[PDB]
Subunit: 372 residues, 2 copies
Amino acid sequence: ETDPEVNQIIKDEVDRQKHSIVLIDRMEILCQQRALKAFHLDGSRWGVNVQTLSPANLQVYQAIMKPHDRLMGLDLPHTYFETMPYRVDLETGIIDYDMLEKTAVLYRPKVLVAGTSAYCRLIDYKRMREIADKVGAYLVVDMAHISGLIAAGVIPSPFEYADIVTTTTHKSLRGPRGAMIFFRKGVRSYYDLENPINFSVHTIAALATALKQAATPEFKQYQEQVLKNAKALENEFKRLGYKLVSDGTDSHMVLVSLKDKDIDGARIETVCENINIALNKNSIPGDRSALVPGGVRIGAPAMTTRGASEEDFVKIANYIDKSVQYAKKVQSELPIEANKLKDFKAKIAEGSDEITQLKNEISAWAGEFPLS
Amino acid sequence: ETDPEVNQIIKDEVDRQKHSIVLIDRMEILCQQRALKAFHLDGSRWGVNVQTLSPANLQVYQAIMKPHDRLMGLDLPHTYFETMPYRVDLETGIIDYDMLEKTAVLYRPKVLVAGTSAYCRLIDYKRMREIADKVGAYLVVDMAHISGLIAAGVIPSPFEYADIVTTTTHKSLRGPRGAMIFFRKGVRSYYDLENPINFSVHTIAALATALKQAATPEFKQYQEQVLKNAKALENEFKRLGYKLVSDGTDSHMVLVSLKDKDIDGARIETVCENINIALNKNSIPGDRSALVPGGVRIGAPAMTTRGASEEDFVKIANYIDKSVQYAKKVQSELPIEANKLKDFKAKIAEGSDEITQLKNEISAWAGEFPLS
């Protein structure tokens, strides 16, 4: 490098990535144009507030609702504004639109928000609009995790029905670290969102290119692959006998249930961590304890960027199944006096022949892919 | 570029800079070591909380003081915590330590903060400590604008007397955009700052190098030049008959008074803007209106980085004097029916022979310097 030992730390970290499968003024005006073009938005119906120095959703709430007003979102708490959650149906994993409607009619929120939590299926934005209208609420859609899918046009757009739409520029949209808040202009049913939003709130070159890239057909090819790779994963987990939350996915990620395997997702996360597989434990509907998450969240985008295919993702599913089989083994073999998660972690941190086998196998396989 | 028209916007902006004189996990552990080494800090007496994703001072207040507790700082308002200001002596421009002490003894703040406002002289951190002890307050020093000067060792260090010290990593310290909060450990008189501070709260490679560079003798040479360049400016403004706030500077910036010239700093800012000179209007002690700032703030660091010398800064002073002489002319020649700042701005935006002369003169001179 230019000088320091920093060079080696970057070298070591870059090298660890390569051998791991990851499953997790005038320029400003240009960003506004490219943002609207990326999401096929009429400039007279839709405005947009971009920002590189930056939460995004919190700024929208303080802009539009008073301290008396109340908000509804997926799995929120019951801080400054009043909140009541809505939930997925326990048996199907799909948003319970009936209960949402009924609660919203009584609760009468000022804002109805969607896309906050980890939800693999498409959201019925039309039904969200209809529920929001009955109450007279704003419909805010956080599209931060599916923004790339929407830009590509490979899933439906919330911009047909939303009043406000928030997104990060860095997650699904593949740009630099910032945020964008889209808002409506014109006939509501009247709109006065522009001023309060703008009032409530080096890399802008980066974002401008990232918005241009987002509109390309090469980008759409990538997002098509993301959806395919996530489906391949859905089907192999189903074939290997796992239940999925929402019985599958319409998007870039899968949420695997582990209830039927008699094990939790934290245990799976740590086993995977030690064999060069990055994924997240994740709470699922049905869990007895909020501190013990009964599922695992797996996402396709990172390896798809590395040139991975459905064949590679069917293989990833097997490696994860192998990791649950190993986690089941070691947990059952732990003594009853030291059974807890702490003891499981201590045990796995010691190593084994099987861990070194799997790590080396996964490491070498992962090394075959480049960082595109 | 890689593709877009963005290329030209960067080209045009870079070109405008060149012809303008500007007067305004393991890696984390490495940043902590280098930060302490940069400010010659014993690791057992001083800790540090670094952060690239990021206000810094607000986090310190919420950490250390309850809602009953109160704060004192230079020229604060009388939002969530109680604040009372202290001020500079109207006639000398130096902090009125007598009045601070007297107010602090009565007010009894939990926190005494220094280095918040634009103050060109050295702060008596020892006297701040002594005042803070009499009350039992914490002494928080914001060194964001003089951090580079302190690292070089060319001015006294607040770390001898402070309990907490905040800084941005990007202003005086010449690093990437982030923040650091230093805090004490050991015998207060007892310290319990580490946990509450840490609890209250890609480029980290950049910061690590920036902290290494900050400790070099080449960096110290740069800061020595900054102080020299700012002094050259102090002396030429004095020679040309201007009063300075605090009758001069002990630091990287000068604050010029314009009261004796019968003109305000906003008018000077706009004239300078139109002749490729970037500086800030700035309020000064004595001002009748808070909306009409009676001074101008000029800083040496930017051109010093471009290889500028005292000879160049004595020339900069003349260009600014020329700009006040022009601003006096056009304002006196405006009709009484359209005298206001609005009318002054309209007038200057039209252009003139003198503006084009000065812009071209300043532009060509500025073009001689590189962007080192």
